[PDB]
Symmetry: D2
Subunit: 309 residues, 4 copies
């Protein structure tokens, strides 16, 4: 069938939520790939039954074989060690190299979404080893980080969460750049709401800090924050598959935007049938650019540690 | 059942699309009311069958009896003469009076959406004769007019239509106030896109004029523009019914916003379970306010003609 | 884009509902084609704005040019005279011939759904003149006629309409074959509900007659029954486009099923990415077959009148 | 707000998928309750962010306080020990007693769905201690077990999974009664497909055995089968909340159906705004009844072990 084939390279906790959401949305056939024996087949089996409840017809199959990447339209990479964090960098580089080789051989035309931490480094490593065009590979970041910021502001203002829009750029992770100037509520500048004393600057500062620290907050509450990451990835994948042309903030190859080249960073892009159809460069002021620069420097620092043991 | 009961007072072309969309969305039971004998029952019958295709369970029934307003949770008023246009004003005032009397008697707790042209006048007339609280009655305008502006800009910029946000205020109709300053694309100020020569000021001026004249453009093409009006109304009704708290631009009672009282005008409001939960006042500059004032003056001019023959 | 292109050949009342539903469901780009100047462009314009309300990105464009069939993935034919009814048969044959020639030239790989009355005749005429494979062209019938039967029974039994399943075969129109034996409720034989005195044989007979006469009932109520037809067609088109492999009763070329060849008739088929993937032959008894035979005879009678003036 | 409040009593793996699906479907506000400190708040936080991606507005909050059951419209009970299995029976009885006391005090009008193994026993225990009417409490079973049977047959026959309908009754668990006679495909008796050699009796026997053993199969593949259970529960909860009146097989109080009283067993019921609106008794033959009797006997055997230590 001409249904899309979506291969999840990595079938951990985020993988299972992604599979669930693909079936809910009838987005395409799913392969849960993982190096762990049996487990992806078990999760695939469980998930496949939900086709009945969902009125969908998506195959869900497990795989321990890289060659099942053949014919993939979308590949989502979450595989990688997670337990210095910097020590994992050369190990995960090797994983990106291996995965990239298989993409080059089996599905060179696939659209690739990378998630493996640190994403802004790992996406570029996979880009270089997979050989795919710059418009066909992106990293998770801004959709996820802004979902937090948007959500927290929406609860304060008592409006629909999607009606808050916001931009976090540069990198996923602790050096993410939260741009106060680019927040809107129902399309209205947030500053109007500050002027009206519906929300204060001090509240926003606390919300900014909460946003940066959210993954840590959930971990400290004895949960693992994989559900929102899954939903953000599926929003990205869906925009590609359905040619929605949504503006979504993702990690993409910079070719001079923000004064930066030869590196991936978080910025609004337009995702449609041709992949990254547009890279949007926010017209940052010097103070915002300085923070963007710090985010890029940290990506570069980690990229340098990733190459050798 | 505690399913919502949605009464469409007026079962013309817009009524049938509204009924169709309510069933698609399984939003509640529908009554198609109209003074015309038989026709609403026929349209109700046809529409009811789509429950099967939609996996829905919404009753659709016709009515020639006002007392079927009893128990309505939402009432959508499209009834009124349409063929000077000013001569119809006293006739339609009488229709609002009659409908308001029946709302007061049969469904005083209902949330009311008025559509009858000119909406910013007719909504206030129905408010006064129905006796409903100011937070429980609104008029169509801004959702519809901005759908045009958003759509036209989205096709120019090749982005998802919903990713363009915009504000048109004051009134529905030819004095609508298009606010260039409040347009965004993926939450980014439109001016950044003008700066980048992705869209020009001259293109936007042509798009503004096209927006104002769109209903006329479609009429001149030998069609009747009732589909987008239907969808805009259902977006409003849905936000109420599901407590979405969307920011949607609607006609609402002004109590000093923009310097205006004792009149309805178009402005962003938040629609949820308590009706109009918030009236948002845009911080307009003097030039924008002047245009808002012209829109209000025209509503007042027509309101004055509506009372007597 | 690899979005599907869906061409509606005929932009009358059913066309506008079809366009509306395609945008609601984000199913693909739409062309409203019609020989009438301007009107399809006006309806396309109106419908296009609903992308905003629907969170969709489907182009809707009008057309007065047959060559805009180029690249069509799905073609829905509703064009044809409607006002003896038999006198229209040779006129509509000419319309099918013209449309078939354009399909052969411009979109030979398209999946075709015919609606033009009488559908079981017109579908075969278009099949023969378009040259498309037998698995790539079907006619509306059973989805629409059974939606009525399913709906009426569901209201009697107070169950979800989709939970009633039923089969009407042979032909669309007054010789449709309603099969009492093949009705189920939640997958349970209807006879169990008759045994339990939840519904009587006499009620079902009245419901059968109502089903056959439903289009006439709605016309006699001074409405035009185009909404359910639109929804049935879109359910068919969607099953194809999304490779759902739904079992849906449609008019298809019979190659010996029910003892009949060289004619189209209503029967359950499976619709997916390869079009008509399976033709399901119900194991009818002799009494049911006799009624099927009458339906085929009437199609053949009209087919014979269609060729010459 | 009059949004529904849905309390998940138990915030384990199934709880998190349930929360995810409620937000996807915008079904209501969610409370993740659990005796484990902090964890439900962490999962609630993560899940809440998906409102942005989903265009929803459902609150998701954690709770370690039983009194947060107050105002619940739906309560889903998954809490209970899981690691003889019979030894857990008196422990889980105590958990049902505690939970029932809190339901009686805080939300006596709530609709209750029980999941705790063994469900057909635990549902009755909670019924007796909560005091809720028999139409307001059900147990998971048939929706889940039939999703497997439907799915496996649909893959064999290459049809849409929802187009296969089937009945498994008596009890959830190893004594479940699979009824070959009540399987249909597109509403057609499965026997027609056996007659046609599209599927064999021997294949169906293997599929029956696979269905009974599916949870064990997934466990043996080193996964945990909680995703399909979550989706089945949400289909049940949704039918109630939206008054869909779906026919869904659930555990319910038998008052003479199948010759059985004073016990809960799996049977088709209709779920709508009044809860269990209809209990449907399949007209089983003596051989099917004998298997139903074995399922009831096993529920009774375990119910007897549950009371005392
Ligand atoms: O599968 C998991 O266990 C898992 C857990 C947490 C995650 C967080 C992020 C993130 O914050 O970028 C991305 C992916 C994740 C995957
Ligand atoms: O039912 C109809 O025939 C009809 C036609 C056009 C309309 C336009 C508007 C609008 O532009 O506000 C609102 C309602 C309408 C209703
Ligand atoms: O566009 C219209 O005006 C129109 C009206 C009625 C219809 C009925 C059927 C049907 O019953 O097969 C099919 C198509 C129709 C189209
Ligand atoms: O939360 C979990 O870990 C969990 C795992 C398996 C389950 C199986 C069933 C089932 O087969 O009835 C019901 C609930 C479950 C919950």
């Amino acid at each position: 069938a001409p249904k899309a084939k979506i291969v999840l390279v990595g079938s951990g906790m985020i993988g299972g939520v992604m599979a669930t959401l693909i079936v809910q949305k009838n987005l395409g056939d799913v392969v849960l790939f993982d190096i762990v024996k049996n487990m992806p087949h078990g999760k695939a089996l469980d998930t496949s039954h939900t086709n009945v409840m969902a009125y969908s017809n998506c195959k869900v199959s497990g795989s321990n074989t890289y060659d099942d990447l053949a014919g993939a339209d979308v590949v989502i990479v979450t595989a990688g060690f997670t337990k210095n964090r910097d020590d994992l960098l050369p190990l995960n580089n090797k994983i990106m190299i291996e995965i990239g080789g298989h993409i080059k051989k089996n599905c060179p035309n696939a659209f690739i979404i990378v998630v493996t931490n640190p994403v802004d480094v790992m996406v570029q490593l996979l880009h270089q080893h997979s050989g795919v065009p710059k418009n066909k590979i992106i990293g998770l970041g801004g959709v996820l980080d802004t979902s937090r910021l948007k959500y927290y502001i929406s609860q304060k203002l008592n409006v629909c969460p999607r009606d808050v829009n916001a931009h976090i750029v540069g990198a996923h992770g602790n050096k993410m750049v939260l741009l106060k100037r680019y927040i809107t509520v129902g399309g209205i500048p947030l500053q109007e709401f500050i002027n009206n004393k519906l929300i204060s600057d001090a509240e926003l500062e606390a919300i900014f800090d909460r946003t940066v620290n959210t993954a840590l907050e959930i971990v400290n509450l004895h949960a693992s924050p994989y559900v929102a990451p899954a939903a953000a990835i599926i929003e990205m994948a869906e925009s590609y598959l359905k040619d929605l042309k949504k503006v979504l903030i993702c990690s993409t190859l910079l070719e001079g935007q923000y004064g930066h080249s030869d590196i991936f960073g978080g910025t609004p892009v337009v995702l449609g049938a041709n992949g990254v159809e547009q890279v949007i460069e926010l017209q940052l002021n010097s103070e915002e650019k300085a923070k963007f620069d710090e985010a890029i420097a940290e990506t570069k620092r980690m990229k340098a540690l990733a190459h050798h043991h």
